[PDB]
Amino acid sequence: KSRKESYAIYVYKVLKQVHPDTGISSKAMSIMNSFVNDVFERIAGEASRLAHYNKRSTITSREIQTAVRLLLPGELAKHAVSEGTKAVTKYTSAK
Amino acid sequence: RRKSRKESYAIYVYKVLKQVHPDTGISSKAMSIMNSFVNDVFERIAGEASRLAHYNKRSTITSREIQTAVRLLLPGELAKHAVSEGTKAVTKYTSAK
Amino acid sequence: PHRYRPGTVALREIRRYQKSTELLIRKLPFQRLVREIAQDFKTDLRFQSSAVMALQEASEAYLVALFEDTNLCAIHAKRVTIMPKDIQLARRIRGER
Amino acid sequence: KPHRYRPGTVALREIRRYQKSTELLIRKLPFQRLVREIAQDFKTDLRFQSSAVMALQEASEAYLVALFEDTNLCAIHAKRVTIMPKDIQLARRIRGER
Amino acid sequence: VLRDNIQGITKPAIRRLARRGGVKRISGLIYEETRGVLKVFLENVIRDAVTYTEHAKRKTVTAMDVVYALKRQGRTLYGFGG
Amino acid sequence: VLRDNIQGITKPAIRRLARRGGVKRISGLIYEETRGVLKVFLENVIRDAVTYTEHAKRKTVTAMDVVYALKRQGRTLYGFGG
Amino acid sequence: KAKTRSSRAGLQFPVGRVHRLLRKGNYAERVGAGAPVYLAAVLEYLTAEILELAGNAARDNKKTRIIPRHLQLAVRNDEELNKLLGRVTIAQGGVLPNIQSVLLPK
Amino acid sequence: RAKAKTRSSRAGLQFPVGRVHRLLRKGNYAERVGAGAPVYLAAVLEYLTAEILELAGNAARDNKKTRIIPRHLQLAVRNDEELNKLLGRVTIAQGGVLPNIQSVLLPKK
DNA sequence: TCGGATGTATATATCTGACACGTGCCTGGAGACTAGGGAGTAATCCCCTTGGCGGTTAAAACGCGGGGGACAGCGCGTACGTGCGTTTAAGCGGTGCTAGAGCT
DNA sequence: AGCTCTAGCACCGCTTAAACGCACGTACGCGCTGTCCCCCGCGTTTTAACCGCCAAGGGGATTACTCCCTAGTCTCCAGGCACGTGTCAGATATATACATCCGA
């Protein structure tokens, strides 16, 4: 289809939560969208390897959590894992 | 209990060895390296063939994807020979049942 | 009349080009070089305006990064003038040569 | 007086011998303890397969040997025969490891 | 047929790149060495880019083709698409 | 329990590695620099290997875990399976 | 009433889109419901980190619109984002201002 | 029923087309795998196997050895400019390194 | 030392095209329900990792002489930087087209 | 296979500032030298790596069984994405502070 899907709106919403007074150029937004897609591909890519290495058939939070710990550096991983686990905890508990 | 069958390219690597050097043998360590090499090159070509299919939003990996992955991953003349060998195999195979 | 000593303006140019984001290579000459190379792989190829810019952005970033590595090895030889052997060493240690 | 080889003569002989052979140059037991020591900082009471320790040693020795080659080039580039810490630091910096 | 376009990259352009790279003084031979290095770099990137174009059976090299080539060569470029 | 084992890698062992690397003359300061470099290398590889072991809920680090750690680290090791 | 999975998790990034991409990307035969929630949170967190450092760089340059320069500065100044994006080139990002002390005047 | 004949034998290949086909599916590289894909891939893998084994056998004879060992594989992969590029990021266990000394280190008269 | 030249920094004002905001709408996410087998549990086994003893014997550590190379200091020249007049062609605006990317 | 109509290609004309050739000085390449130190090669001392055999126990691999979780399917609807919009952020233009560099 003609319609192109991009994380623009979501990146913008995060920007508003971080710096509501600050805007973002279309060029900077293109970089951010490509950045999100690259990091997404890395985590999903490593998550697939983890499942295959264990001959598993489904990607779970453990694979994502492990991929994050492998791909992201020390502090980013620890902080990202806290955010990820919190989001999964709230999602399942809120129901 | 009995050990679970683990597949390996050992006998196939050996048959290829008998063609290039009938008098030459290969140690288990060297065979393990050759098996690792075959598996690694397999995963690399298959991995690039996957990206190619996804980039063109194709659902099937065909000889076109494999041929292109080979041209990308193999350097210089290795690509030309590999493409020729792959083409010869596929063309002759198509003549079979 | 007044004149700046050797290297005085060079240091000013370094600050200027590090503070500036614009492409340092002329767009049209770089585009012709891309065309000259592409025609060897396939005749009558076409390039999107964004594709030519993408090649230039990567090429300039690659060369700038290489010059930094080159400058570091030049300094290691207690020199300030970069020489071809510095570029060769950088590319060799980077594993691209 | 006893016969003595000139400085660097035996070094060249050592280079040839170690480049001709494929034997691992680090002692297995000291390296094995080092591996578990580093591992002990990540998870207590870990176990290591015998082949896992060998795999780490093969990679570690190959990495250091390759780094020493890059280190020798930058040392030679500075018109020096003796490699210095700045040679390793530069090789690693140019390799993008720092 | 375009030819001898490598010499089209002006001498100051190489200087500007070196200046951005922090190079204070540039030897007169760096210009030819830099042209040769860029020639090799572009050949490698264009070869893969054209390969993606040919595999897609297209005649126009798309920006995504260059990004994929750069991505395969471990020099992923952000800003030209995902 | 295990401690200071980094000093257990003897000075000749580093020399032998340097000799295989073709180094004809080695300054005495290289030994400490080499140990530090090796320590961070092993730390990066072991961290990933242990991470695969933990994900598999296993208690022993297998050769595959090491090969996958190395493979992910960007250096592939042939001869240990996979 | 339908409530998007992102709002349930308290996230802005679309869990639905991440779930669709995980399934359509053929990363595995199956995808657990927890995977897209966890992944969306990680992507949202890393997005916030980049935007925060980029916004600070923008404010430091007395600018109120993030441009590629601010993104490059943020990525290279952070000791961890530079490690994650060490192999990454940013369009129009330029380079960090840096001159070696050996080059400066006596 | 016709006599079962392996796809490898039909293609004139030693490498198992069936195994390559199974692995291409089990690895989930794509939703579908064309019958021509494993034949082409098996031929490429078989060719590259022959290329290394040919050079490795030559290195073995040059060392007066009849069995290929990791040393012969390393010498072959590193002496060939193209195989060294394909396996530049690859480390071979017990393979060692090429016997090369920088000319500047050798003595002078 | 040091004062003069003088590039960069900063404050003000005009402008504008870019992005911040609104809209229509439609498609793909959300809700609902199912099958069914992947994942999880439990019980078992056994093999291979951890640990110890013994001793030896090769390898490591230690001291030393000394030599050759690390490199501080110097010469000096020619190479590279700075400056200028020249002029080149890159960049821009505009017009023509139509191959061929995109979609059905 | 067919249609569309995008935008890549080609060309002209003008601008002007980047590119160039050249003048010419001294910054810096590096050949040469002194030297002293620290690294080498060797003998000696010694220590802990290695071999080898035995323990044992745990955790990895396996089987059996289950179930609850995900993929498929369906409905639904308002979230998100092209289109529309405009106003105000930073480019452009000007004024003008203030540090640094060089020649004396």
From Swiss-Prot, chain A:
Core component of nucleosome. Nucleosomes wrap and compact DNA into chromatin, limiting DNA accessibility to the cellular machineries which require DNA as a template. Histones thereby play a central role in transcription regulation, DNA repair, DNA replication and chromosomal stability. DNA accessibility is regulated via a complex set of post-translational modifications of histones, also called histone code, and nucleosome remodeling. One of its GO terms (cellular component) is nucleus. This is Histone H2B 1.1. There is a cross-link at residue 90 (Glycyl lysine isopeptide (Lys-Gly) (interchain with G-Cter in ubiquitin)). It comes from Xenopus laevis (African clawed frog). The chain holds residues 32 to 126 of 126 of the full protein. Belongs to the histone H2B family. Signal peptide: none annotated. The nucleosome is a histone octamer containing two molecules each of H2A, H2B, H3 and H4 assembled in one H3-H4 heterotetramer and two H2A-H2B heterodimers. The octamer wraps approximately 147 bp of DNA.
UniProtKB/Swiss-Prot annotation, chain D:
A lipid is attached at residue 74 (S-palmitoyl cysteine). Core component of nucleosome. Nucleosomes wrap and compact DNA into chromatin, limiting DNA accessibility to the cellular machineries which require DNA as a template. Histones thereby play a central role in transcription regulation, DNA repair, DNA replication and chromosomal stability. DNA accessibility is regulated via a complex set of post-translational modifications of histones, also called histone code, and nucleosome remodeling. The modification Phosphothreonine is found at residues 44, 71. This is Histone H3.2. The keyword Transmembrane does not apply. The modification N6-crotonyllysine is found at residue 20. It comes from Xenopus laevis (African clawed frog). The chain holds residues 38 to 135 of 136 of the full protein. Belongs to the histone H3 family. The lineage of its organism: Eukaryota, Metazoa, Chordata, Craniata, Vertebrata. It comes from the Eukaryota. Coiled coil: none annotated. GO terms for cellular component: nucleoplasm; nucleosome. The modification Phosphotyrosine is found at residue 5. The modification N6,N6,N6-trimethyllysine is found at residues 20, 43. One of its GO terms (molecular function) is protein heterodimerization activity.
UniProtKB/Swiss-Prot annotation, chains E, F:
The modification N6-glutaryllysine is found at residues 11, 39, 57, 59, 71. There is a cross-link at residue 71 (Glycyl lysine isopeptide (Lys-Gly) (interchain with G-Cter in ubiquitin)). One of its GO terms (biological process) is nucleosome assembly. The modification N6-butyryllysine is found at residues 11, 24, 57, 59, 71. This is Histone H4. The modification N6-lactoyllysine is found at residues 11, 57, 71. It is found in: Nucleus; Chromosome. The modification N6-succinyllysine is found at residues 11, 57, 71. The modification N6-(2-hydroxyisobutyryl)lysine is found at residues 11, 24, 39, 57, 59, 71. The modification Phosphotyrosine is found at residues 31, 68. The modification Phosphoserine is found at residue 27. The modification N6-propionyllysine is found at residues 11, 24, 57, 59, 71. It comes from the Eukaryota.
Curated annotation (Swiss-Prot), chain H:
The modification N5-methylglutamine is found at residue 94. There is a cross-link at residues 3, 5, 109 (Glycyl lysine isopeptide (Lys-Gly) (interchain with G-Cter in ubiquitin)). GO terms for biological process: heterochromatin formation. The modification N6-succinyllysine is found at residue 85. Monoubiquitination of Lys-109 (H2AK119Ub) gives a specific tag for epigenetic transcriptional repression. Following DNA double-strand breaks (DSBs), it is ubiquitinated through 'Lys-63' linkage of ubiquitin moieties, leading to the recruitment of repair proteins to sites of DNA damage. H2AK119Ub and ionizing radiation-induced 'Lys-63'-linked ubiquitination are distinct events. Glutamine methylation at Gln-94 (H2AQ104me) by FBL is specifically dedicated to polymerase I. It is present at 35S ribosomal DNA locus and impairs binding of the FACT complex. The modification N6-(2-hydroxyisobutyryl)lysine is found at residues 26, 64-65, 85, 108. Core component of nucleosome. Nucleosomes wrap and compact DNA into chromatin, limiting DNA accessibility to the cellular machineries which require DNA as a template. Histones thereby play a central role in transcription regulation, DNA repair, DNA replication and chromosomal stability. DNA accessibility is regulated via a complex set of post-translational modifications of histones, also called histone code, and nucleosome remodeling. This is Histone H2A type 1. It comes from Xenopus laevis. The chain holds residues 12 to 120 of 130 of the full protein.
